[PDB]
Design a protein around this nucleic acid. Structure first.
Ligand SMILES: [K+]
Ligand SMILES: [K+]
Ligand SMILES: [K+]
Ligand SMILES: [K+]
Ligand SMILES: [K+]
Ligand SMILES: [K+]
Ligand SMILES: [K+]
Ligand SMILES: [K+]
Ligand SMILES: [K+]
Ligand SMILES: [K+]
Ligand SMILES: [K+]
Ligand SMILES: [K+]
Ligand SMILES: [K+]
Ligand SMILES: [K+]
Ligand SMILES: [K+]
Ligand SMILES: [K+]
Ligand SMILES: [Mg+2]
Ligand SMILES: [Mg+2]
Ligand SMILES: [Mg+2]
Ligand SMILES: [Mg+2]
Ligand SMILES: [Mg+2]
Ligand SMILES: [Mg+2]
Ligand SMILES: [Mg+2]
Ligand SMILES: [Mg+2]
Ligand SMILES: [Mg+2]
Ligand SMILES: [Mg+2]
Ligand SMILES: [Mg+2]
Ligand SMILES: [Mg+2]
Ligand SMILES: [Mg+2]
Ligand SMILES: [Mg+2]
Ligand SMILES: [Mg+2]
Ligand SMILES: [Mg+2]
Ligand SMILES: [Mg+2]
Ligand SMILES: [Mg+2]
Ligand SMILES: [Mg+2]
Ligand SMILES: [Mg+2]
Ligand SMILES: [Mg+2]
Ligand SMILES: [Mg+2]
Ligand SMILES: [Mg+2]
Ligand SMILES: [Mg+2]
Ligand SMILES: [Mg+2]
Ligand SMILES: [Mg+2]
Ligand SMILES: [Mg+2]
Ligand SMILES: [Mg+2]
Ligand SMILES: [Mg+2]
Ligand SMILES: [Mg+2]
Ligand SMILES: [Mg+2]
Ligand SMILES: [Mg+2]
Ligand SMILES: [Mg+2]
Ligand SMILES: [Mg+2]
Ligand SMILES: [Mg+2]
Ligand SMILES: [Mg+2]
Ligand SMILES: [Mg+2]
Ligand SMILES: [Mg+2]
Ligand SMILES: [Mg+2]
Ligand SMILES: [Mg+2]
Ligand SMILES: [Mg+2]
Ligand SMILES: [Mg+2]
Ligand SMILES: [Mg+2]
Ligand SMILES: [Mg+2]
Ligand SMILES: [Mg+2]
Ligand SMILES: [Mg+2]
Ligand SMILES: [Mg+2]
Ligand SMILES: [Mg+2]
Ligand SMILES: [Mg+2]
Ligand SMILES: [Mg+2]
Ligand SMILES: [Mg+2]
Ligand SMILES: [Mg+2]
Ligand SMILES: [Mg+2]
Ligand SMILES: [Mg+2]
Ligand SMILES: [Mg+2]
Ligand SMILES: [Mg+2]
Ligand SMILES: [Mg+2]
Ligand SMILES: [Mg+2]
Lengths: 272, 95, 76, 7, 46
RNA sequence: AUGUAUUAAGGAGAGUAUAACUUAAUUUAUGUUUAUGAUAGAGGUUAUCAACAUAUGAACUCUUAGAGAAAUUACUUAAUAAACGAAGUGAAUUGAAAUAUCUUAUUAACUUCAGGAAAAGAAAUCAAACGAGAUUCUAUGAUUAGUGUGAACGAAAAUAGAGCAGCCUAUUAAAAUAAGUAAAAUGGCUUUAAAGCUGUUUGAAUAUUGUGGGGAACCUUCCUCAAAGGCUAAAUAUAAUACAUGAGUUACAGAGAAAAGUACCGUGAGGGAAAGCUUUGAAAUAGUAGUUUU
RNA sequence: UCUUACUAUAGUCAGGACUAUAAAGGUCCGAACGGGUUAUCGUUGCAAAGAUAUCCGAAGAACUAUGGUAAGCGAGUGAA
RNA sequence: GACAUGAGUAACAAAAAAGAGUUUAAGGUACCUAAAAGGUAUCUUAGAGUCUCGCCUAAAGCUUAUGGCUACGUCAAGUAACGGCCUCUAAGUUUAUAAUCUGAAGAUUAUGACGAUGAGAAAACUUUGGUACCAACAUUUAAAAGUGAAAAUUGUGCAGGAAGGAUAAACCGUACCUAGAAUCUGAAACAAGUAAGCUAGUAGAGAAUACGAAGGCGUGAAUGAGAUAACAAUCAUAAAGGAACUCGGCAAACUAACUACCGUAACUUAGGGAUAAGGAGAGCUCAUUAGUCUCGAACGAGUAAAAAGGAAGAAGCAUGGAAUAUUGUUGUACGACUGUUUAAUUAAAACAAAGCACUUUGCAAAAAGACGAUAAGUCUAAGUAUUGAGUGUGAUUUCUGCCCGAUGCCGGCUGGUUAACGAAUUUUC
RNA sequence: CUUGGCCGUUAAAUGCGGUCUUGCAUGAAUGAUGUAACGAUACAACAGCUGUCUCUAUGAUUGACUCAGUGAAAUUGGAAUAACUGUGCAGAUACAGUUUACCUCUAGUUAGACGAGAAGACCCUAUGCAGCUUUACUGUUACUAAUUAUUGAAUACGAUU
């Protein structure tokens, strides 16, 4: 469906700019991507398409049972013709009766832990790389949907949760029935591209960014002064929020009860 | 504009979809492709009788001086519903 | 429809308004019809064309004298 | 305006 | 100094901003009409 | 300008006998008195040569069904401005010779709701050892008591006048006499510290056989009233119309408006003229004439 | 209805050259068009921002048209 | 408010331009003529037109918009040869409905309604998603050929390119004006500004440049006729010298376009530099001709065919003959670059920029950030740590050192402090 | 300080370029530093070119000028509105003394009338304003922390005693 309106320029329903540096890009259409994948059965990848409003690539799959087509985030290496299946709505009969037992942790992983297959995080063995990690038992995928991102399974519990390490390095507690696609998000070379010119940024709906030092004392805490002057003022946003030093913008009353090992803060040190 | 802009806008001043009728009446309905089908149940006709042999003219000779009707003792002289009913009995009783 | 010139209520005083428009209709007759020709100027005596012509010229000149004054001039 | 100014 | 801001001005925008329906159908517009009516104006809008 | 009387939804568009007003734009009738009125003719367009009183036909379009670029569409026996009133919200200029509390000010303004007025109202009122006896408006009390560092702010009793009306069986139809109420702590408002209003947390009693509230911190006796339920005209506010009065105006005056919220200005909100008559004809100013000087 | 940004629907850019392309370039020369570099004139001007010459961009972060949106306690918009 | 002064002065100069005849209506004079009339000539006011000359011309022309203080006899069922109304919807709007939030006012989400700058059957008679789509760009296609549109076909690049509905003739618009000659906006009869189509021909790569067929114009006396001082503006030429001028080569001049021409340095991010620099050629006439074309009958002839063509020739001071394209080179500072900026005194070294770096955001019901008298809620985003936001720096080569004391932020003890709360207390009347 | 010393450029270098540097008061993302490319940026030099100049002259058009027609503006206390020296609210057409000048216009010109225009932007004043700044005074918020209320249990573990 088309992506049009004043929201493309960074305006909310009031009409004022709530997101700076937006507007004027190319005309786009939104692609309805499936992040739940409840319908079971084999799905044939028809083609790997390019999504403008996404970092990774989307694959147009086709349900061989009904013929319905849908979009899904393509995995690193997934090509046309590959067969994917979602075991989120339970295991099929043919696969369940083969082993005969109630559950065979060995053979199930050998036949279902394939690239592009969506399974509950519990059915995936430890050490597997996934890129559509869910949060709730019946919620869509929310983590590692960007290009080149993935997550590993640290440990499993009898328990209702499983631990996974996200792209940021945060080991957090995830539900047991949370969905997860095996593999890595395609387009792993996205963070290496270079636009080359200012005009290419204007096509992507990015408008110029004016620095606080370039403004007057009336519209920024950094404005004012003769010549180039920071003003002995600690870096802040136009509204007084510290822009450096480690000030966390997460609400204190909203404690993350799913965090096992928090991220490793760099603390302003240089990486390279 | 300075002053003509302050007059009442008419159909002879603008063309960008500005329509304004002259209260001529609705004679049909518009179609979905821009036509008009006339509903003759709304069209009006003029019932003009046969004037052949009619002797009355719109003027009366001034020799016949004007004289108003008199209704002594009756406040609603000409509009009296009783003198109309009583007069009806003698003149025309059937209808 | 024929429009009318906007005018002031009292000629040269009052608010600016516009009279009601005029509507003319042209019927395509099935039988032809021809109008008579106007009488010659020397045959309009039944309408007092002689006196009416003098009064018209008198009013005709009065409107020309006012037009010269409206331009900021005077007849030498 | 006037350009002559004894600034 | 003044500018020629009425160049290319259309009469459709005159009716959408200062028209009559743009006032009777609004909360603030009813004040304008009620104000101009108490003063005695003949031109309540446009 | 004030006073009195009456009245309680206002405008626009276009059209039309240019004193006559709504496509019927000068309708049609009745009664009385008509020069001792009222305050023995001529005349239906060469008209209305009849005033008063009571009736009567007609009275378009928009605001004002729905839509829309008001006076259009499309339908149809579709239809209520402002000012004044109560509550809620609530500034600043200014003064203090600066300025914070204060003052300006329970002001302006805005929002909601309501009627021709509204609100308020027949004491859980004031008084002080005597007594008054609802509310509302005006004056005195009063540049007072009192508060405030100051600047300033500022009552009540009572008196006089305008009106006067009491009730629950309310001249419109309501109470089985009022409990999360009175009251307390705390945060505010108001204010003199009481009384009154109020968010939060808590939380009573049952009539002079002295139960409850009040009487300006507070306690006590006495006096006084009887909350947590209601009704009520008049005097008052505003607008319109009419009339009365005038050491009020008489045209740069009086209303902005003697043809006006019109012309004109502004995108707009909004701003906003000039202009009387047949009388008189000052000063400045201009071209000449007489005398006189150059 | 000016103007800034955004937004919807539309429209315009003679000709030529280089470049890997027949079409892939904030490429080149240069009209329309859009800017306003320098100079002179004008300064009770033709003009309360104009005239002439010169100069810059001219397939792009381009320009233009008709609508719409965001402005006045907080500041709308702002390649500032 | 009236009337003076300046002053009967400035002004009526877009570097298009006028000259000589004719003529209508009304009226004012002189003469002829005295019966009024009429005639001849002339002047004034308002017009019209003929001949000649010039200007605009991808306009100052024609046909139509936005619009209009110009004027009202402007005529349509539909197509050819027409828009609106009407139907559908975009961005958005809503004193419509429901729910929700909210000191009132109101706000929010859904639905409905409304809303063009878009899409709407047939007619010279008519009533699924590349099996795709109709954004940009390129290509091909109504068969005699060429050109320009319409629509379609095929392909290319990334920046990945609407929605919805379908599929016997009413009502409204129709005049005139388009800005160099009487009409729009700029206070106005203003040397400014404003949309679309057409806009002869010659000559060219061309909408450049020059001419200009038709058409219009050479203003409403808002002017006209003379004279041709100083000086000013806008221009032309110039002996010898050639920046001696000046803050400074300001201004002006030199240079210039074209060819399928030759040639081209340091340096370089290997693309450039470069159209470097510096040279050559050009018009008219003509020998000559492989094919194409024409004429006659393979061959012959022909440029009253397009082209090719050469060390050919003629004339003049001169053949890029007139007009149009405004020098070359060199060393630094600043900013990489193309761009943007104080509308109307500063266009730049300032801003932006690709790139670089740091801080921040795990999305379990609110990701952070922004907005919300203040919330629901909206953008962020139908995004997910290679995401978004904020801050600084400002491509790339070579590099980015020392100090955590001060300040800020972040983290950390079964710690100290610690208001409210509160064990234990203490009063006035 | 200062035209810093030296070298090149110029007949002549307070300039420009290179270098030495003991830097009033360079410095590393308030980035340091060197090239290609780019620039209506700024500075300096060369060649060519020219009326920029030595040094102006001539010519053309439109104004200027005269005649006819139409017809402004700023401005103005009133004026019979000379020169010099002195004087004086301290720079005289107007006062003192002396001198000079028949009355009146036209076209030029701008020395003066402390010429006209804008109740000086500079400077200072006022217990006058506005915006901005901060570890100014006094305040409100974002945000952070504890707790009554909505709101109830159960083990503990333990401390007061
Ligand atoms: K018209
Ligand atoms: K006192
Ligand atoms: K109290
Ligand atoms: K009671
Ligand atoms: K600009
Ligand atoms: K039609
Ligand atoms: K509300
Ligand atoms: K030059
Ligand atoms: K030759
Ligand atoms: K910078
Ligand atoms: K820099
Ligand atoms: K340190
Ligand atoms: K520190
Ligand atoms: K540039
Ligand atoms: K003095
Ligand atoms: K002078
Ligand atoms: Mg940003
Ligand atoms: Mg950036
Ligand atoms: Mg920036
Ligand atoms: Mg700045
Ligand atoms: Mg600040
Ligand atoms: Mg500094
Ligand atoms: Mg029009
Ligand atoms: Mg319409
Ligand atoms: Mg302005
Ligand atoms: Mg415009
Ligand atoms: Mg309605
Ligand atoms: Mg209606
Ligand atoms: Mg009193
Ligand atoms: Mg004091
Ligand atoms: Mg009781
Ligand atoms: Mg209480
Ligand atoms: Mg008490
Ligand atoms: Mg009480
Ligand atoms: Mg007491
Ligand atoms: Mg008056
Ligand atoms: Mg008088
Ligand atoms: Mg007189
Ligand atoms: Mg606009
Ligand atoms: Mg380019
Ligand atoms: Mg001058
Ligand atoms: Mg260029
Ligand atoms: Mg160019
Ligand atoms: Mg003079
Ligand atoms: Mg003169
Ligand atoms: Mg003159
Ligand atoms: Mg004559
Ligand atoms: Mg609709
Ligand atoms: Mg349309
Ligand atoms: Mg013009
Ligand atoms: Mg023109
Ligand atoms: Mg005009
Ligand atoms: Mg041309
Ligand atoms: Mg013309
Ligand atoms: Mg002429
Ligand atoms: Mg010479
Ligand atoms: Mg020479
Ligand atoms: Mg020199
Ligand atoms: Mg010299
Ligand atoms: Mg020769
Ligand atoms: Mg630059
Ligand atoms: Mg400027
Ligand atoms: Mg400039
Ligand atoms: Mg860098
Ligand atoms: Mg959030
Ligand atoms: Mg460092
Ligand atoms: Mg430390
Ligand atoms: Mg306490
Ligand atoms: Mg630094
Ligand atoms: Mg003259
Ligand atoms: Mg002296
Ligand atoms: Mg004297
Ligand atoms: Mg002079
Ligand atoms: Mg003097």
């Amino acid at each position: 469906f088309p992506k049009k309106g004043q929201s493309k320029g960074g305006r909310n329903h009031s009409g004022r700019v709530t997101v700076r540096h937006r507007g004027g890009g190319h005309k786009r259409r939104i692609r309805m991507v499936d992040f739940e994948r409840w319908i079971p059965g084999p799905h044939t990848v028809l083609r790997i398409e390019y999504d403008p409003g996404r970092s990774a690539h989307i694959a147009l799959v086709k349900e061989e049972a009904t013929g319905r087509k849908s979009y899904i985030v393509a995995a690193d290496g997934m090509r046309a013709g590959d067969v994917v299946q979602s075991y989120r709505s339970g295991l099929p009969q043919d696969l369940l009766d083969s082993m005969g037992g109630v559950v065979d942790p060995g053979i199930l992983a050998a036949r279902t832990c394939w690239r592009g297959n969506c399974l509950p995080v519990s059915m995936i063995p430890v050490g597997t790389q996934i890129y559509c990690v869910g949060s709730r038992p019946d919620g869509k995928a929310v983590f590692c949907r960007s290009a080149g991102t993935y997550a590993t399974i640290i440990s499993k519990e009898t328990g209702k949760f499983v631990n996974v390490r996200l792209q940021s390095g945060e080991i957090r507690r995830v539900s047991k029935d949370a969905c997860a696609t095996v593999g890595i998000a395609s387009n792993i070379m996205h963070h290496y591209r270079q636009l080359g010119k200012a005009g290419r940024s204007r096509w992507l709906n990015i408008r110029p960014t004016v620095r606080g030092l370039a403004m007057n004392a009336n519209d920024h805490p950094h404005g004012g002064g003769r010549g180039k002057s920071k003003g002995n003022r600690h870096p802040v946003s136009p509204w007084g929020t510290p822009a450096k030093g480690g000030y966390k913008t997460r609400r204190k009353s909203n404690v993350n009860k799913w965090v096992v090992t928090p991220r490793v803060r760099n603390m302003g040190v240089r990486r390279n | 504009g300075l002053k003509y802009r302050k007059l009442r806008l008419t159909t002879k001043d603008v063309n960008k979809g500005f329509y304004k009728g002259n209260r001529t009446g609705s004679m049909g309905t518009h179609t979905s492709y821009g036509t008009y089908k006339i509903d003759y149940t709304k069209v009006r006709t003029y019932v003009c009788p046969d004037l052949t042999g009619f002797k009355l003219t719109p003027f009366v000779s001034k020799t016949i001086r004007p004289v108003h009707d008199q209704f002594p003792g009756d406040k609603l002289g000409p509009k009296n519903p009783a003198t109309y009913l009583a007069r009806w009995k003698s003149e025309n009783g059937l209808d | 429809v024929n429009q009318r010139m906007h005018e002031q209520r009292h000629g040269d005083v009052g608010n600016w308004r516009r009279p009601k428009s005029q509507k003319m209709m042209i019927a395509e007759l099935a039988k032809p019809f021809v109008w008579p020709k106007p009488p010659a100027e020397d045959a309009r005596e039944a309408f007092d064309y002689a006196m009416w012509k003098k009064q018209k010229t008198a009013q005709e000149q009065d409107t020309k004298f006012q037009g010269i004054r409206a331009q900021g001039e005077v007849v030498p | 305006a006037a350009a002559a100014a004894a600034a | 100094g003044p500018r020629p801001t009425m160049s290319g001005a259309t009469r459709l925008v005159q009716k959408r901003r200062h028209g009559f329906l743009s006032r009777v159908k609004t909360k603030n517009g009813q004040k304008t009409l009620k104000r101009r009516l108490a003063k005695g104006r003949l031109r309540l809008s446009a």
